[PDB]
Amino acid sequence: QRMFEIDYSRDSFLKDGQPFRYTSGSIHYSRVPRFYWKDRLLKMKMAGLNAIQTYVPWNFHEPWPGQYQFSEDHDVEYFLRLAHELGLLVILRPGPYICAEWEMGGLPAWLLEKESILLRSSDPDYLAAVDKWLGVLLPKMKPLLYQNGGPVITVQVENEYGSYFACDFDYLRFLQKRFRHHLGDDVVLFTTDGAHKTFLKCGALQGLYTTVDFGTGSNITDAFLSQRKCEPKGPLINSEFYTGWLDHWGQPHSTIKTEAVASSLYDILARGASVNLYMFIGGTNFAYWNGANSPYAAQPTSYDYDAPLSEAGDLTEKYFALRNIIQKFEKVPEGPIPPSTPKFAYGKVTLEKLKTVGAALDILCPSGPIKSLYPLTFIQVKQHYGFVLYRTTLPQDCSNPAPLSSPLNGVHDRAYVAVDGIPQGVLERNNVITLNITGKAGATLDLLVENMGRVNYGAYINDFKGLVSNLTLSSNILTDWTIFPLDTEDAVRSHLGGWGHRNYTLPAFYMGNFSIPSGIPDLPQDTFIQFPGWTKGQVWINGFNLGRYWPARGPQLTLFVPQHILMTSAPNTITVLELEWAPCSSDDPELCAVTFVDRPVIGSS
Amino acid sequence: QRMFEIDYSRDSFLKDGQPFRYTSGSIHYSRVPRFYWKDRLLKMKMAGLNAIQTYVPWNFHEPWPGQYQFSEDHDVEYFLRLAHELGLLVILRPGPYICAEWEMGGLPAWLLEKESILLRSSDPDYLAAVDKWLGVLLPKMKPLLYQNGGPVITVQVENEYGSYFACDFDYLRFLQKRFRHHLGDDVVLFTTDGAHKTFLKCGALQGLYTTVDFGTGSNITDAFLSQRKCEPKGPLINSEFYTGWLDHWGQPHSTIKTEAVASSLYDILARGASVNLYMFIGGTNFAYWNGANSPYAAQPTSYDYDAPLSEAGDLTEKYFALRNIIQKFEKVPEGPIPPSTPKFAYGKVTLEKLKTVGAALDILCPSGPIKSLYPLTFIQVKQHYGFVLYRTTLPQDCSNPAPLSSPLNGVHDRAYVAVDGIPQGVLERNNVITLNITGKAGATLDLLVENMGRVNYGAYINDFKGLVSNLTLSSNILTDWTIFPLDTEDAVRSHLGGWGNYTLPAFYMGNFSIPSGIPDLPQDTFIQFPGWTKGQVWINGFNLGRYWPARGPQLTLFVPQHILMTSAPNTITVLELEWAPCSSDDPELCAVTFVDRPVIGSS
Ligand SMILES: *[C@@H]1O[C@H](CO)[C@@H](O)[C@H](O)[C@H]1NC(C)=O
Ligand SMILES: *[C@@H]1O[C@H](CO)[C@@H](O)[C@H](O)[C@H]1NC(C)=O
Ligand SMILES: *[C@@H]1O[C@H](CO)[C@@H](O)[C@H](O)[C@H]1NC(C)=O
Ligand SMILES: *[C@@H]1O[C@H](CO)[C@@H](O)[C@H](O)[C@H]1NC(C)=O
Ligand SMILES: *[C@@H]1O[C@H](CO)[C@@H](O)[C@H](O)[C@H]1NC(C)=O
Ligand SMILES: *[C@@H]1O[C@H](CO)[C@@H](O)[C@H](O)[C@H]1NC(C)=O
Ligand SMILES: *[C@@H]1O[C@H](CO)[C@@H](O)[C@H](O)[C@H]1NC(C)=O
Ligand SMILES: *[C@@H]1O[C@H](CO)[C@@H](O)[C@H](O)[C@H]1NC(C)=O
Ligand SMILES: OC[C@H]1O[C@@H](O)[C@H](O)[C@@H](O)[C@H]1O
Ligand SMILES: OC[C@H]1O[C@@H](O)[C@H](O)[C@@H](O)[C@H]1O
Ligand SMILES: [Cl-]
Ligand SMILES: [Cl-]
């Protein structure tokens, strides 16, 4: 019978009766394709880590109530078995809120169908949904608990609840009760909060062990004293020792020096503390999974994070320096390290425009639109991610430019506006709430509205999306709306129906093919796609949504392309949805193209 | 129907009635694992070549009489269909003698069962063997001719016969006839010789189109004049334009500057000549396949050649330079070129002694030895490659150092000498024909003799191997021999039966694992032997060739990834012949290393 426990007398963990502490690394299985899970986990082991830490994003597994995804890239059970087979332990963080620069901090958007829900509280509607999620997830985690033969040694309840305004201790008690019900009475349950009494006040709970987080700019002594104030006995734990930091579109790429991380890691380890490296590998926010901060600023597609392992899993100087730190305390595994993957510049691939969004509406919205007097939000129209088209008619002639506006700043988050197929420009949450339009009376006014990511931290995580308040034209509220939820993902997988079902330009889908020879042992290889001359959009290869590009803002210019979605002999189909301006009018088809390169550019001006 | 022909009227090839010239690179399918055949061939095509040229080594396919190998790495037909699939035409060179820095110039050693055989002549026993070989090979090549829907556009008869002393024209005429009977009247048949009347004299033949070869050192106008003397009309052809040159153990690694190859290549092509780059990729002489020159000098395991593609298929600066010459004459295919393969340094892998050769004779020689009054050759003992142990007893006492000698220099090619299991040192063909030994009377005298590779060029290609003449001790002829042919390949595959200043020749073995479920492992690597001296190496039973870090220039041996596994451990076996770094109290010195770069040009 296997045991894992906190030893209070000796300020230590006990593993099968023996003293234990962990040196862990954060890896998010939802940000690494499964094809590479073993690769990253093995490099994590060879670095000298004896555990890994991950988050379970609720919204990654229950995109509608009672419809679950636990297979393929969503197979959290297999991921945890893979960690166990490699001799790694696991610190599980199942939320139900994870923060994590992930859409809505992991909470499902369909929770907002109750408009007034208070998230992360004893709101009975929030609790009932949490409870049903825990009834599905936790029984799957139970045989993976250390004491039942699996790798899970500790489990985090909530995530820095001390940072949220609500301070609902009933909430935290309900989670504890439920985690206990499903997992048993022996599993070590813990919390993590900023290393300061003001955060620990509302984050800490009797019965759950109190850990802190802090990075290389914090005084180590103060931070651990802050923890000691809440737990006078038991191990010192930094649950998120920051190896890097998050980005936002339009801001420079965050970095943290190798020497600062190495030195702080040395100091933490020397105190005998358990430590988790956040992030050890960051990876990618594929599709629409990124989050945002308030005041509204979205995080980009890359989650490279400047982590010791790069986005594509490369071994960096930082990796080796940290491995060397760990070597001073433990005997790191022997033998060569699995390498940085080979990267391949497939070169330039021409695209051509297939159809505008407005022309593809039949395929994007095959059940037809929802008619409404005033606009409806993403949530009301039963779409959570991507894009929704809002359509009306001009109730006046606008031969002279008239102001189209959202007086309460409720374009959440960007609208690409057209009037009888003539693009008018953009409305933008917080930046531009008015845009002048022209056209005749009775012209069709289209706003293509993009969810850029639900805020994942702060008070404003109840971030519905779409047109969340009225639009006016010349000060008068525009009524009579036709609203098309866009099934972009299906439509792209069907090549807009073409394959069956077995200054600005109009938002449109541009497609192009490239081939890769068979019988070559080293092809395909990973690559990086770049969009010189494009502006802002979404990109897919063979229907796999790689995420968002926005070279107009940076810092990210390339997107990471893992080799397993690429195919040999059979043509690889690139689909680009360009929202703002495509380099594709002129009589040079060579300009209407993307380029694959062999080094990332995530760190641009 | 398709047509390929020489139009003499027009000084050109005509393919389907249209003017044609080829720009070809040599690739020997026998020197590249089949796992990488498509890689090398598609790199060749992206370089701008419209054809490849290969040699068919007889002995690679007919190791004993009427026992054939045409499968897997030996599948020539497949290799040609592959070239064809990729849109490449083929210049086939089926010998029967191919030269090629390859064991006896491709000729099987079993021809030497007739001691007096005159190789490459109308010796009727040579011709009868050749003829049975042609009757198995050429009916296979027939459907692969251009005219029957395959890739083969021209076929070479013999190889540089003008360089051989025999000058037997009836041999050449027999070859033409038998090539015609099996291939038909339309195939373009041709010969290749050095570009000088003295080489063409005995190489050229009526009804076989005369081509020449030459490298970057030659006057290109004079070279083609020497050909035009022989063929006043038809295409100019340099069948072997040297991109590089061969190596010998113990000599500096050969190189030819990129600018010289590019320069000549442009000049040849500009004349409207057809040309074949020898080698475009060289590859590897795995196992015992390397040849030798006279006076006896063996070529190494690596056949990199300083070719445009390195031993391991890598794209080199030479490669891009020649691609760029070709581009000025022909649009070259679009798209990215397949990359140089990633290389992985597996690092250090410790070995430990398994068995001496002396102590492994039951598994190496399970038939029992051969008693003979005087020494027999490798051929008489029915073994072709590798090693044979010769054993006798000392007749006199050698308390004091007695001379052991092969006075006619008859150790072919190297002997690892032991008396009662005490290594005495080494006898070398052409270099050390005497070694002073000691031991008691009745002591066991052992000589482990190595076939270092049969000479592939010159008069002395009838290279029997073994103790080819007598050995004397204190000038007395040593008699009464117990001779053990050694099944090294089976023994190694079976871990020497254990299934489920000098040292004694001995096998050393160790293991290393590679993780499964890593998309980019295993990778190609280079194995290196710091501290070792001379020997043979197998990984998972596959004989990667010979090592000789004592002599150079080659220090690393190429290991291709497809023979490496992840489902169970990989085994390295070394047969060290001279000195093993495994006596020290430090097991960590008894070890090889895998690195991620080649060292084939050490001084
Ligand atoms: C950190 O804080 C302690 C007191 O808790 C202080 O005494 C120490 O000097 C500080 N260290 C640094 C590096 O500022
Ligand atoms: C819209 O047009 C009016 C002129 O009618 C101008 O005063 C105002 O600056 C414009 N607003 C925007 C957002 O361009
Ligand atoms: C739109 O306009 C009217 C105010 O006249 C209000 O009743 C309604 O709630 C507003 N709708 C939205 C979505 O803001
Ligand atoms: C791209 O590929 C698919 C088949 O894989 C096909 O349906 C589409 O029409 C192609 N276009 C081109 C130019 O190959
Ligand atoms: C080659 O020889 C010819 C005479 O045959 C002479 O005209 C020419 O200069 C030589 N070319 C070179 C490059 O030496
Ligand atoms: C014995 O061997 C030595 C060592 O090389 C050799 O030089 C010498 O000629 C031999 N001595 C006699 C007396 O024959
Ligand atoms: C060795 O010696 C004797 C001559 O004294 C002779 O019968 C025989 O030809 C020789 N054998 C070889 C292999 O040299
Ligand atoms: C496999 O190789 C390892 C080297 O780590 C060695 O210790 C072990 O004895 C080998 N096992 C077998 C079955 O040869
Ligand atoms: O990368 C920044 C991190 O900040 C922490 O406060 C949070 O707990 C993490 O989930 C993540 O948001
Ligand atoms: O690399 C030197 C070459 O010499 C050629 O003349 C011969 O035909 C080839 O087989 C090869 O040996
Ligand atoms: Cl985590
Ligand atoms: Cl050839």
Curated annotation (Swiss-Prot), chain A:
Family per similarity comment: Belongs to the glycosyl hydrolase 35 family.
Name the reported effect of residue 392 to P: In GM1G1; loss of galactosidase activity
Which Gene Ontology cellular component annotation is one that this UniProt entry carries? vacuole
**What does altering residue 40 to W do?**
In GM1G2 and GM1G1; loss of galactosidase activity
Instruction: Supply the source organism for this entry.
Output: Homo sapiens (Human)
Query: Impact of changing residue 309 to P on the protein?
Result: In GM1G1 and GM1G2; loss of galactosidase activity
Q: Name one Pfam family in it.
A: Glyco_hydro_35
Cite the binding residues for substrate.
55, 101, 159, 305
Swapping residue 406 to L leads to an effect described as: In GM1-gangliosidosis; unclassified clinical type
Tell me what disease the record lists for it. Answer: GM1-gangliosidosis 1: An autosomal recessive lysosomal storage disease marked by the accumulation of GM1 gangliosides, glycoproteins and keratan sulfate primarily in neurons of the central nervous system. GM1-gangliosidosis type 1 is characterized by onset within the first three months of life, central nervous system degeneration, coarse facial features, hepatosplenomegaly, skeletal dysmorphology reminiscent of Hurler syndrome, and rapidly progressive psychomotor deterioration. Urinary oligosaccharide levels are high. It leads to death usually between the first and second year of life.
The protein here is known as: Beta-galactosidase
State the pH dependence.
Optimum pH is 4.5-5.5.
**What effect is documented for mutating residue 493 to C?**
Galactosidase activity is reduced to 25%-30% of wild-type values
Q: What is the effect of changing residue 54 to M?
A: In GM1G3; mild phenotype
Which residues fall in a coiled-coil region? none
Question: Which PROSITE patterns does the record cross-reference, listed alphabetically?
Answer: GLYCOSYL_HYDROL_F35
Q: What is the effect of changing residue 537 to D?
A: In GM1G1 and GM1G2; loss of galactosidase activity; severe mutation
| Effect of substituting residue 211 to M | In GM1G1; loss of galactosidase activity; severe mutation; causes a rapid degradation of the protein precursor
SUPFAM superfamilies cross-referenced by the UniProt entry: (Trans)glycosidases, Galactose-binding domain-like
Gene name of this polypeptide: GLB1
Curated annotation (Swiss-Prot), chain B:
User: What outcome follows a substitution of residue 173 to H?
Assistant: In GM1G1 and GM1G2; also in a patient with a slowly progressive GM1-gangliosidosis form; 36.2% of wild-type galactosidase activity
Classification via SUPFAM superfamilies: (Trans)glycosidases, Galactose-binding domain-like
Q: Which residues are glycosylated?
A: 219, 436, 470, 501, 511
Q: Which disease is it linked to?
A: GM1-gangliosidosis 1: An autosomal recessive lysosomal storage disease marked by the accumulation of GM1 gangliosides, glycoproteins and keratan sulfate primarily in neurons of the central nervous system. GM1-gangliosidosis type 1 is characterized by onset within the first three months of life, central nervous system degeneration, coarse facial features, hepatosplenomegaly, skeletal dysmorphology reminiscent of Hurler syndrome, and rapidly progressive psychomotor deterioration. Urinary oligosaccharide levels are high. It leads to death usually between the first and second year of life.
Query: Outcome of altering residue 253 to Y?
Result: In GM1G1 and GM1G3
Result of altering residue 551 to W: Reduction of galactosidase activity
Species the sequence originates in: Homo sapiens (Human)
Task: List all disulphide bridges recorded for this chain.
Answer: 167-202, 582-590
> What is the pH-activity profile?
Optimum pH is 4.5-5.5.
Q: What is the effect of changing residue 406 to L?
A: In GM1-gangliosidosis; unclassified clinical type
Q: What is this protein called in UniProt?
A: Beta-galactosidase
The annotated consequence of residue 127 to R reads:
In GM1G2 and GM1G3; 6.7% of wild-type galactosidase activity
| Outcome when changing residue 493 to C | Galactosidase activity is reduced to 25%-30% of wild-type values
